[PDB]
């Protein structure tokens, strides 16, 4: 009376389950329901299903209906199966222990469950100032363990760039935008850069980027006290300090030197007096200006002193002396 054994409707069943599906979630089975048929009559025609194989442990099968569901006490993770493909053996038994087989081929679908991740999370990089537009500063990289659009990453700067830095959305190369990079304008930058996936609930991971502007000595010394007039007793002896010129250089390691470059002497009748180059000296380091020759209103009533400062450490000649020069008028007073 048991002249037949069970026999599945298809020889391979193709099925898919979304990862992180909760327990009891049924398989989505693309080619009909799992079904086995035994052509005996009566009691010898009833079947009981088993599910067998390497990752059978992740599932349970109703032995009456052959429906397959996510076992409880387990979590299915697509990042733990490479390829994302599972192969299982369906077995069908009648009451005499006669068999039928078919094949369950299961694809784990992808859930956007992994964050774009920066390793390292932080970047510190030196960039020399006066760099041309488009100079590559660095490249940041993130990794997302998901795949398809869930793993594909667009880079962006959320803030800190100040319109002086741009980032290529794909490569993650950070480069210089339109504006120039002057260390004296700003000596560092902190960027919050963001890598974001394209899952339908997009996930993001961020990275701190610190950018450190190295110095070229490219900044000219500037007198803080560029015009003065001082009246000086005709009885002021040589060595007497009468004025002090001071300049400031915003580069990292200036060596400032102060020079008198002209002295122009005038009569109380306003005509030039020649060869008065030696009337005043200037301390080369402090900018302290002293009387140097003996004085007299009757010989020279006024001196126009012109004073300049040079950074010796300057890396560009064109930004190494003062503009303007310091001007000190000196006016002699009778006794
Ligand atoms: Ca049978
Ligand atoms: Ca997962
Ligand atoms: Ca995933
Ligand atoms: Ca992702
Ligand atoms: Ca500069
Ligand atoms: Ca500089
Ligand atoms: Ca300088
Ligand atoms: Ca006198």
Curated annotation (Swiss-Prot):
Residues 9-118, 119-223, 224-335 form the Cadherin domain. Glycans are attached at residues 63, 99, 178, 217, 244, 312. Changing residue 271 to H: In strain: CAST/Ei. Changing residue 319 to R: In strain: CAST/Ei. It comes from the Eukaryota. It is found in: Cell membrane. In adult animals relatively high levels of expression are found in testis, skeletal muscle, heart, eye and thymus, and lower expression in kidney, lung and brain. Found in the sensory hair cells of the inner ear. It is linked to Defects in Cdh23 are the cause of waltzer (v) phenotype. Waltzer mice are characterized by deafness and vestibular dysfunction due to degeneration of the neuroepithelium within the inner ear. Three calcium ions are usually bound at the interface of each cadherin domain and rigidify the connections, imparting a strong curvature to the full-length ectodomain. Cadherin repeats 1 and 2 mediate calcium-dependent heterophilic interaction with PCDH15. Cadherins are calcium-dependent cell adhesion proteins. They preferentially interact with themselves in a homophilic manner in connecting cells. CDH23 is required for establishing and/or maintaining the proper organization of the stereocilia bundle of hair cells in the cochlea and the vestibule during late embryonic/early postnatal development. It is part of the functional network formed by USH1C, USH1G, CDH23 and MYO7A that mediates mechanotransduction in cochlear hair cells. Required for normal hearing. Interacts with USH1C and USH1G. antiparallel heterodimer with PCDH15. Isoform C1: Interacts with CAMSAP3; leading to inhibit CAMSAP3 ability to induce microtubule bundle formation. This is Cadherin-23. The gene is Cdh23. The chain holds residues 1952 to 2286 of 3354 of the full protein.
């Amino acid at each position: 009376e048991n002249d037949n054994h069970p026999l599945f409707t298809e020889g391979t069943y193709q099925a898919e389950v979304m990862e992180n599906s909760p327990a009891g979630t049924p398989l989505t089975v693309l080619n009909g329901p799992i079904l086995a048929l035994d052509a005996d009559e009566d009691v010898y025609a009833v079947v009981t299903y088993q599910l067998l194989g390497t990752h059978s442990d992740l599932f349970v099968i109703d032995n009456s209906t052959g429906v397959v569901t996510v076992r409880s006490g387990i979590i299915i993770d697509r990042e733990a199966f490479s390829p994302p493909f599972l192969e299982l053996l369906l077995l069908a038994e009648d009451i005499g222990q006669l068999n039928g087989t078919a094949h369950l081929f299961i694809t784990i679908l992808d859930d956007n469950d992994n964050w774009p991740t920066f390793s390292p999370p932080t970047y510190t990089v030196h960039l020399l100032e006066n760099c041309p537009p488009g100079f590559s500063v660095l490249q940041v990289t993130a990794t997302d363990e998901d795949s398809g659009l869930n793993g594909e990453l667009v880079y962006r700067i959320e803030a800190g760039a100040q319109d002086r830095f741009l980032i290529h959305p794909v490569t993650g190369v950070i480069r210089v935008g339109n504006a120039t990079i002057d260390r004296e304008e700003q000596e560092s930058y902190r960027l919050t850069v963001v890598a974001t996936d394209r899952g339908t609930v997009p996930l993001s991971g961020t990275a701190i980027v610190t950018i450190l502007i190295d110095d070229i000595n490219d900044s000219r010394p500037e007198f803080l006290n560029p015009i003065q007039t001082v009246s000086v007793l005709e009885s002021a002896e040589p060595g007497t300090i009468i004025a002090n010129v001071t300049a400031i250089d915003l580069d990292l390691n200036p060596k400032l030197e102060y020079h008198i470059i002209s002295i122009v002497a005038k009569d109380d009748t306003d005509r030039l007096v020649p060869d008065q180059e030696d009337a005043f000296a200037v301390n080369i380091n402090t900018g302290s200006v002293m009387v140097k020759s003996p004085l007299n209103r009757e010989l020279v009533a006024t001196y126009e002193v012109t004073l300049s400062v040079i950074d010796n450490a300057s890396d560009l000649p064109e930004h190494s002396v003062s503009v303007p020069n310091a001007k000190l008028t000196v006016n002699i007073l009778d006794v």
